[PDB]
Each structure stands twice: as structure tokens, then as C-alpha cells.
Design a protein around this ligand. Structure first.
Ligand SMILES: C[S@@+](CC[C@H](N)C(=O)[O-])C[C@H]1O[C@@H](n2cnc3c(N)ncnc32)[C@H](O)[C@@H]1O
Lengths: 223, 127, 31, 260
């Protein structure tokens, strides 16, 4: 009856979708390229279990240099890892001259500033992302004191960044763009970083498959 | 200056996992064309071929329990095995134990039939 | 429940798995 | 016809006309001094709840302003603020110093209120490049509300000169003192923490009159009990530290002037 017709329709549907599956797995084994750029270096490991000494040795062997920019979008405790465990990461051994970019929520602004100053950096700049709607309006949110429609990136610095490498008077502090996807930052931060340090060796911590970029070393357990 | 292509290849060879590179530094784009946790590694394909060689065709539960691990989609095993023989109806081989050479000759016969009757799709005939 | 299964957020393997589970459930309910 | 991005982000300008200064001398408390850092404010105020420090930082060897030593020398008494919020202007290069010297006094960071700077010079130059609109100045554009159309405001930000990423925002730090005896009556989620306002490309640190009115109304509707009332006569709960004769003489506000 109705269940028999449903079974016939489900047989037609599996016959239709097997064609799509076989088309996809035949085009995959033919030389199809994904959206991930070729020069991306992704590492899939927990930062609490990753040996950073191997990364230091590999970077010093294959570049004769250290990282220029370290960008972080930490999973704040509200995968919500920790605060002290985020502090304990060996950023000091990961860099000697350049910048750091840490994305901070309003509840972890002070903690991010304290971590940046405890890693040896000095706070010099701040980048804010203002969320947007499809009509070019601010996407109102929620909060305790005021309606939050912002997100902050805090920027430190080490060493002498004026030798010949980093540019000055570039980009902007404000990123006005839509809040697409999940808690995912825009690509304007990557454009601004490439404007700051053209053709550099970057490092991204707590990364996802949308964070994979050219010349970027990306670390993330879901990568 | 620094050549970023060879630098990226060397860094991927040293640091990235086996499923991310192609044992020469080149990016494995099949890994990033699918979702995380479902890749169907060549080791998985060889294990499925060994399972078809050892046990019968259609007994996907034994292959899931032994030849892979404990995590294997029965639907995906059926689909990949159907792609192995080259026909989208794995029914006439139910129960037979098929090795690699006869698997290849069955796939060749199926692809020749598909090309000779002009009713062929991508590595499946029509069934 | 084909409308729930056929959404533009699922892979073809996930859709096929849901369809096969639905077919198995229909077959078992008939028999 | 008025549905541009620039017109859509500037509706508060039509909705926030500021009021006139009070006439009767019992709605405010205006005091003039010479050094606010050394002066004791406890003798001139009470248990106030809103302390807006309108401090202009220097950060240069050739322009006027105040340094962090002035904030360190400034004495905020334990009975001048018990349940209060400090509103202090911030800058990128001394944000850590401001936070440290204020958490030394007992005030903890709570929130951020950013004024995203928009240029009345860059918008005019964009309109002139794209194209009645010749004899008009950015200050006239500010004080007539005649703004040019713009569907992409990201190109008209006031990108001021900085060694690092260019400065195009104005940050108002909010810091609250917590006391377990009394409680503070707030009003949650009545104003957005991001606020678009027009500026000029000659003085990016000068907030407009309507922007100042927006900030004052944010403070007033955040703390309603601190507003002017019959019970708050002679016991004002809102204090201004570095006042100017622009929008500060208000209802229920204590105004402190430096060398006037
Ligand atoms: C706040 S998100 C950061 C990614 C960012 N939202 C984006 O646009 O992809 C946190 C990310 O860190 C990952 N993560 C959590 N714990 C981790 C760990 N111990 N080591 C590495 N990555 C971790 C999460 O799985 C997630 O991918």
C-alpha cells in the first residue's frame, strides 16, 4: 500500500543517489582539486600533545628563520579547553621577531592581554570585527551591559620589526563584514596580515579547514 | 629568497600526516574534498580487497569486525565493493570469494560490456 | 521523511546511509 | 532615495538631538580647579555612580594632552566610588597601562563602547570622484546632516596614521567597582556597544555633539537611578572629571574643570 509505494520511492532515491556518489568518487580519482591551496601546511594534532620542538627544528631547517606572525583563535572556556593551558603553550620559543594575533571575547579581554604580556610581547594594536547583516546594517546581539556586536583581536610584538620585513601604515583596525558560518573569522584578517608581512612564514593555532591558506602553517585537531 | 612550493612540500613531508600528503610533499586533495572522518584511505581499499579475497561477498559484518576495525559503514563498504567490480548492482556475486586478478578481469569485462552497449556510466554499467 | 533526509547540508554518503536505514526499517515493518 | 549604507548607519543622528544647558542652578554642580590630579574630589562629591573621565591623551612630543602619570597621580577615593562605573577614553598604545593603573585602584574591565570613525572628507572626495556638491565643507556636512550616498563605508573610514595598523576607531573603556554591601541598578541591553559616527580628517579625537549626546544617553539609560530627580538634588550620582563647555553642563551631573 502506502508503505509499498514508499519503499518503491526509496529504491528510486537510492538508485538516483548512488549515481551522484559514483560520479563524485570517480571525479575525485581523476585529478580534482579542492578549495585548499597547494602551499598550505596543515597539521592535525592537539596543541597539548603536539611536540613544538619538532616544528621548531623543521622550520629552522627548511627556512633558516622563525615565524613572522602567530595567529590564535583560542577555544575559550564559556572545544572550551582552558585558560592556564592556553597560557602554557610555548609561544616564546615559537618566535623571536614579529607579531601575534589573539582573538578575544569580551569575557576574556583581560586574560588575553595578560597572556600576551606574559609571553614577552608588548600590546601595540587592536583589530575589531563588526558583524554585519545582508542589508549593510550592524547585526545586533546580546550582552550584560550592552548588546555585543563586535569581536576583538589583540596584537603584540617582539624584537626589532623595522629591519626590512614588516610594512607600516597599512590596512585598518576595523573589519566590517558578515557573520557567515559558525564562530568563524573573516578572511580580511588574512588579507591584512599579508599586507603587514608580505611573503612571510606564518603560523595558525586552533585552525579549521576554512583557515587553510598559502604559506600558512595551520594547527588544529579537526584539520 | 625562499621558494615556497618546495618549502611547503618539505614541511608537509616532515610534519603533516600520511593522509594529508602523497609521500612526496604534494597535497592530498582527496582528503580535503570529503568530510573529516570519512576519507577511504588506500589502506582501507587494500583491506577491503583482502576481505573480498578471504571472506565472501556481501558478508560486510565480518569485514567490519575483522578486516577494518570496528568503525566501518556497511553502506560505504557495499558501495566501494560495487565500484570494485564495476557495476552498480552487487547481486550476482553474492557469496563468491573473489581475488584481485579475477576482480580486475570482472571489472574489465563490465567496462567492455558498458562500452559495447553504449549504456555506460562512470565505472558502473547500468544495473 | 524524505524531506528531512534530502537537505543541502548532508554528504551523499550520509544521505545514502539514511535512505538505506529507512529502506531497512520499511522492509522490517512490512515483514 | 535614502537607503544607502551611510544613511542606514546614521539614523541615530536624526533621533538624538541634544538638549539645552540647564538654567536653574540646582540641577548641576560645576567646580573649577587647577590640578585634578592633586585635588581631593571627596570633599566636592559623594557616592557617585558614573565617573566619566574625558581625558585627552598625549602620546607625542609635539601635541597637547595628558600622560599616564596624570592618571596615576589622580586620587579616586574609596568613598568617592563604592558602586560605580568609570568611563575613560582609551588608546591602543597605552591600553595596558590604563588597565593596570585603574585595576590598581580597584576598577575591573567590564565592557567596551567603540565609536567607529567615518570620514566627512573621504566621503566628499568619493562623491566628487564618482561624479550641486562643490562649495561644501566637511564641518558643514556634520552640522547640516547633508551626507553623500555610500553603499560601501569601508573605504571612508578615518584611517589615521599609525606605525602599525591604521587607527580608525575610538574606544571608551568601561570599568566597574564591585562592593558586596550595596547594589547597582542597571538596565541590560538597551544600547549597542558599536556606534557609527562621522568625524573629520583633521581631528579624529573630537567626537561630535550628537555622538557625545549618544554616549551621555547610554550612560543615563544604563544607570537610571543616577538620573536627575527630586531625591538626587544636592547628591548627584554622576561626575565628570575633565569637563569642557560643549555638552557637559547637564542635569544631575557634577562637572570638574581644569584651569578655566
Ligand atoms: C574557536 S574555534 C577556532 C577556529 C575558528 N573559529 C575558525 O574560524 O575556524 C576552536 C578550534 O580549536 C580546535 N581545538 C580545540 N581544542 C584544541 C586543541 N587542544 N588543540 C588544537 N585544536 C584544538 C577546535 O576543535 C576548533 O577547531
Amino acid at each position: 500500500k502506502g508503505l509499498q509505494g514508499l519503499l518503491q520511492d526509496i529504491e528510486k532515491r537510492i538508485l538516483h543517489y548512488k549515481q551522484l556518489f559514483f560520479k563524485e568518487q570517480n571525479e575525485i580519482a581523476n585529478g580534482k582539486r579542492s578549495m585548499v591551496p597547494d602551499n598550505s601546511i596543515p597539521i592535525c594534532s592537539d596543541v597539548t600533545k603536539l611536540n613544538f620542538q619538532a616544528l621548531i627544528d623543521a622550520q629552522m631547517r627548511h627556512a633558516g628563520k622563525m615565524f613572522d606572525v602567530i595567529m590564535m583563535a583560542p577555544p575559550w572556556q564559556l572545544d572550551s579547553l582552558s585558560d592556564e593551558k592556553i597560557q602554557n603553550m610555548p609561544i616564546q620559543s615559537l618566535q623571536q621577531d614579529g607579531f601575534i594575533f589573539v582573538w578575544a571575547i569580551n569575557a576574556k579581554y583581560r586574560v588575553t592581554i595578560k597572556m600576551i604580556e606574559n609571553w614577552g610581547y608588548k600590546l601595540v594594536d587592536e583589530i575589531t570585527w563588526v558583524k554585519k547583516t545582508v542589508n549593510g546594517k550592524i547585526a545586533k546581539g546580546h550582552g550584560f551591559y550592552l548588546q555585543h556586536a563586535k569581536e576583538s583581536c589583540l596584537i603584540g610584538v617582539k624584537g626589532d620589526v623595522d629591519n626590512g620585513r614588516f610594512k607600516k601604515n597599512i590596512a585598518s583596525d576595523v573589519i566590517f563584514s558578515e557573520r557567515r558560518g559558525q564562530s568563524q573569522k573573516p578572511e580580511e584578517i588574512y588579507q591584512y596580515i599579508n599586507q603587514l608581512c608580505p611573503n612571510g612564514n606564518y603560523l595558525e593555532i586552533f585552525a579549521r579547514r576554512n583557515n587553510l591558506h598559502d604559506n600558512w602553517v595551520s594547527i588544529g585537531n579537526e584539520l | 629568497p625562499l621558494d615556497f612550493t618546495q618549502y611547503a612540500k618539505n614541511m608537509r613531508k616532515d610534519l603533516s600526516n600520511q593522509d594529508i600528503c602523497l609521500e612526496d610533499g604534494a597535497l592530498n586533495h582527496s582528503y580535503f574534498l570529503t568530510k573529516k572522518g570519512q576519507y577511504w584511505t588506500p589502506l582501507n581499499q587494500k583491506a577491503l580487497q583482502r576481505g573480498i579475497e578471504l571472506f565472501g561477498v556481501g558478508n560486510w559484518k565480518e569485514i567490519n569486525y575483522d578486516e577494518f576495525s570496528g568503525k566501518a559503514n556497511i553502506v560505504e563498504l557495499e558501495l566501494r565493493t560495487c565500484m570494485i567490480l564495476g557495476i552498480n548492482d552487487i547481486t550476482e556475486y553474492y557469496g563468491k570469494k573473489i581475488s584481485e586478478e579475477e576482480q580486475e578481469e570482472i571489472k574489465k569485462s563490465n567496462i567492455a560490456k558498458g562500452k559495447k552497449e553504449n549504456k555506460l556510466k562512470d565505472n558502473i554499467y547500468q544495473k | 521523511t524524505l524531506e528531512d533526509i534530502e537537505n543541502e547540508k548532508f554528504t551523499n554518503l550520509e544521505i545514502l546511509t539514511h535512505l538505506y536505514n529507512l529502506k531497512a526499517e520499511i522492509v522490517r515493518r512490512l515483514a | 532615495p535614502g537607503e544607502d549604507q551611510l544613511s542606514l548607519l546614521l539614523k541615530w543622528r536624526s533621533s538624538y538631538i541634544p538638549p539645552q544647558k540647564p538654567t536653574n542652578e540646582d540641577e548641576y554642580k560645576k567646580i573649577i580647579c587647577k590640578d585634578i590630579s592633586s585635588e581631593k574630589l571627596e570633599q566636592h562629591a559623594g557616592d557617585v555612580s558614573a565617573l566619566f573621565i574625558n581625558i585627552k591623551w598625549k602620546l607625542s612630543e609635539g601635541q597637547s594632552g595628558k600622560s599616564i602619570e596624570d592618571l596615576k597621580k589622580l586620587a579616586i577615593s574609596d568613598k568617592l566610588i563604592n558602586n560605580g562605573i568609570i568611563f575613560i577614553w582609551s588608546e591602543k598604545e597605552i591600553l595596558s597601562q590604563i588597565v593596570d593603573v585603574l585595576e590598581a585602584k580597584g576598577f575591573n574591565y567590564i565592557e567596551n563602547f567603540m565609536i567607529n570613525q567615518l570620514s566627512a572628507d573621504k566621503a566628499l572626495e568619493m562623491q566628487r570622484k564618482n561624479q550641486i556638491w562643490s562649495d561644501i565643507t566637511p564641518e558643514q556636512c556634520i552640522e547640516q546632516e547633508k551626507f553623500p550616498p555610500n553603499n560601501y563605508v569601508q573605504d571612508i573610514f578615518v584611517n589615521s596614521e599609525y606605525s602599525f595598523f591604521r587607527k580608525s576607531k575610538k574606544i571608551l573603556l568601561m570599568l566597574r567597582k564591585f562592593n558586596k554591601d550595596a547594589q547597582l541598578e542597571l538596565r541590560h541591553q538597551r544600547t549597542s556597544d558599536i556606534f557609527f559616527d562621522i568625524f573629520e580628517q583633521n581631528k579624529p579625537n573630537d567626537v561630535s555633539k550628537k555622538g557625545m549626546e549618544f554616549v551621555y544617553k547610554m550612560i543615563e539609560t544604563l544607570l537610571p537611578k543616577a538620573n536627575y530627580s527630586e531625591e538626587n538634588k544636592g547628591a548627584f550620582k554622576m561626575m565628570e572629571l575633565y569637563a569642557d563647555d560643549k555638552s557637559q553642563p547637564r542635569k544631575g551631573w557634577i562637572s570638574v574643570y581644569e584651569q578655566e
